Amino acid sequence: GFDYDVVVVGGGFAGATAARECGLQGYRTLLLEARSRLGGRTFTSRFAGQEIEFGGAWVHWLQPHVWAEMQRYGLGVVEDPLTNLDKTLIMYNDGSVESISPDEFGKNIRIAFEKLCHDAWEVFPRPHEPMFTERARELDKSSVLDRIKTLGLSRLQQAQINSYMALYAGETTDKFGLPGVLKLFACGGWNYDAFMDTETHYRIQGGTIGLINAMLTDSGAEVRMSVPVTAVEQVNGGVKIKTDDDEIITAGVVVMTVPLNTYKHIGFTPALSKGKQRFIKEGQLSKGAKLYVHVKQNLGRVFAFADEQQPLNWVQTHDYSDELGTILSITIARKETIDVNDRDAVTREVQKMFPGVEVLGTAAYDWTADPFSLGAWAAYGVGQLSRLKDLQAAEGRILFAGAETSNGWHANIDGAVESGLRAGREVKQLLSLEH
Amino acid sequence: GGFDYDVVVVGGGFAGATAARECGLQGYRTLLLEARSRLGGRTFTSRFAGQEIEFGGAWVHWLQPHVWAEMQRYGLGVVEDPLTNLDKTLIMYNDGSVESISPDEFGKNIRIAFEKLCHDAWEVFPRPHEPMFTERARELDKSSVLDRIKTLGLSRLQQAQINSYMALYAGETTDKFGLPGVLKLFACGGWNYDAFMDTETHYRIQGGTIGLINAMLTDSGAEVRMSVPVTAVEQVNGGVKIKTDDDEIITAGVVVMTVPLNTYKHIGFTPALSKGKQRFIKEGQLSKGAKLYVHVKQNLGRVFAFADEQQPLNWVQTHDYSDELGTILSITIARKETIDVNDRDAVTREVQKMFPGVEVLGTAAYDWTADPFSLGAWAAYGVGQLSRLKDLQAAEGRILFAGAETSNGWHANIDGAVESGLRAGREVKQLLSLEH
Ligand SMILES: Cc1cc2nc3c(=O)[nH]c(=O)nc-3n(C[C@H](O)[C@H](O)[C@H](O)COP(=O)(O)OP(=O)(O)OC[C@H]3O[C@@H](n4cnc5c(N)ncnc54)[C@H](O)[C@@H]3O)c2cc1C
Ligand SMILES: Cc1cc2nc3c(=O)[nH]c(=O)nc-3n(C[C@H](O)[C@H](O)[C@H](O)COP(=O)(O)OP(=O)(O)OC[C@H]3O[C@@H](n4cnc5c(N)ncnc54)[C@H](O)[C@@H]3O)c2cc1C
């Protein structure tokens, strides 16, 4: 006699997927989303007359769970075509900027990346079972920086790879676990060309929101937005879920899909396992934010890295023309290096990277300040990947999903989808008995 | 429209099981009709010499996205056939001479030949799931695999190796085998030899292929009938009438055909299928393969052999060995016409030619090419076929088409069958579940 069979908390990819699995089994399913929008760490908006992506958007057929969903819903890819770069820049930690010939720039990053991931085959023969090998468990005592220091890289190569890794970390590279990066590279066919093809080449036709909506529509689930969950109590062979207006909703099972860094907001009765509590206390690393800048000048096709002590860590042309000028897409590794919502500070930093540009407008999303993310994409610290089963583990009638909890493409939309499929299976084991 | 079922799925291989699961979970009243007295189709697990053997498809990989996602859904891990040092690697040339090659050199040479064959896969197939995306792919579809092989400047050993390998993929001689199909598969495997090779015979599914088929059908809620071949489909009264071989008529809103392309001759269609689809049905797909296991008294250890296309034992691998057992060999025959796998004397003589001094204790075989419900083996495209694939995929009113042959990606695989089932489910939903 519960209100619902299953409640899914969070309406990102993990929650949408889990709700779709549950709904198609015939379970009375409710999804609760804290924000007034669906999508979570995916969010498409508009700036300077154009569509922009504030969070995750890029996918690939080597990412199996999301690719299969795209087949199911009939969604093709939209290509962001790869072109000759007009300009490739590196800013070092001291703020000096160097223009590198684009062919040399690309050659150097490839050298550094392949050196960093040289043992991916040996360490991750089964990238979807990250602790299969004793070598992977041993490497989880190391940071990415520990490895970088042994590679014999040139000054340019070291700055490039450190910038790239600080981006993946959303943090300084001394804090970033090594195995997580190797595992991702392994997921991409243990090959630089294939892996790199997964990063910013393809989006989904109709967008991420189209796929979220297709899954929720398919699910038949009830969906409530602007309803943050503040507590879960296990009681009467089910759960009592408390919302921020103090409404109580009862269910047989609850699937938590909220980002790991937001678990501090939620009371649990009884207490979660010690291992899970440890994860909730540490969180995941990333402190990233996303920024778009509209510049009067036509800069053409540009790319820049900035190393970790600087704010504009990844810069790419989103669009350009004589009429438009240039829209720059920028990813900030660490919120503390810049306030993306302070237009003067942004302008000064952009001008340091590109002397002579006039800034016409900015749009930003500070994922690290948003109470319903408190961080960006999933990134593991030293020693975390080894303990991941503690985060995955069911806690009675509370199940756990989200990209952080996936085994494969954990920094991605795909990992979220993966975790939702797992959650649906775990719900089915609790509700649909073998008889 | 008062039909017996909302949807009928014809065939209980991976494509049909997938399509039935997609339809069943939408709440459609779903029926699956399977001709054989078993499910699985071109996957079939059996037993020989005290052990489990695979007579058809069985090996999978996480680079194969549709099947991998299903394995996540149903909680199925992998079972590894471990890679070991090979004790022997042999090549048999077309004239029947056998050379034992150092395993390190044997592996080096096949890599050289394969990489040379697939050198342009990045350029030709930037989007392996959209095979006709590039003009170059459409141009290459005028060429056979052999046309390319002749231009590669391979050594005698390399040429025999790669020709044996390609004859296996073709289930035919390499002069008939379309080039783009092979390049596309390589592209699907991360455009990389090591990744692609890992997909071939490394991992099986925990609980077997039949466990996955059963998990999907159980999940579906669909009614399943075995030993019911369909002999005709007539579109009529806003739906279809399906005729079985006992002349029973079953009505439905929609039907999904998942039977192998080479078996379409057995089925009458009203109205007639499109000219494009008729052309495919007339040509069929290439493969004329069979599967064979041989139990040998001697312990041969871990062995591998290629035989070129004029010989019968084209792919040989140790399935198991020990002093007590002797050896069980797993053998794939590219073309039925080169040997009768069900004639034990002939098999024995061919095995002894490859391994002089062995005593054959028993054999088990499955002649896919003779089975009326496959009439061929794995999907393989002839010259110019890949270019026209949309004609085979295209819905014909309320009859939808699926099966591995009709997939865009891993067409020679379980994964392609799954892919085609997901598509069919979507097409069913568009016909049945209206926008209002
Ligand atoms: C800037 C950026 C760029 C990225 N780019 C890519 C990329 O290009 N490609 C890619 O594959 N991945 C990318 N990622 C990662 C990808 O977006 C994520 O891995 C994925 O979206 C995570 O999905 P999820 O469902 O696990 O979490 P989320 O999407 O965060 O969903 C969790 C949901 O829980 C809700 N919630 C939180 N607390 C509560 C509460 N108390 N009650 C109710 N609801 C609550 C949130 O509002 C949210 O909707 C990017 C990430 C970021 C931040
Ligand atoms: C020897 C062999 C080895 C292989 N190895 C691998 C491998 O290792 N890995 C891999 O991924 N792939 C492999 N494959 C390919 C893979 O098995 C197939 O691509 C896949 O199983 C095809 O699935 P399908 O559903 O399209 O067709 P099928 O499995 O052929 O299913 C079609 C079904 O339709 C039924 N049928 C036919 N006519 C009628 C009728 N008139 N009425 C009713 N039912 C009918 C058949 O009985 C059958 O059950 C192999 C194939 C073979 C033959």
Residue numbers in the entry:
A (entry chain A): 51 to 485
B (entry chain B): 50 to 485
Question: What does the study report here?
Answer:
The nicotine oxidoreductase NicA2 is a crucial enzyme for the first step of nicotine degradation in Pseudomonas putida S16 (DSM 28022). NicA2 from P. putida S16, 6HLNO and 6HDNO from A. nicotinovorans, and the nicotine oxidase NOX from Pseudomonas sp. strain HZN6 (21) belong to the family of flavin-dependent amine oxidases. In the NicA1- or NicA2-catalyzed reaction, flavin adenine dinucleotide (FAD) is required as a cofactor to couple the oxidation of nicotine with the reduction of oxygen to hydrogen peroxide. The structure of NicA2 comprises a FAD-binding domain (residues 49 to 129, 250 to 338, and 417 to 482) that harbors the cofactor FAD and a substrate-binding domain (residues 130 to 249 and 339 to 416) associated with the substrate nicotine.
An N-terminal cut and SeMet substitution were performed to improve the quality and resolution of the crystals. However, as demonstrated by gel filtration chromatography, NicA2 behaves as a monomer in solution.
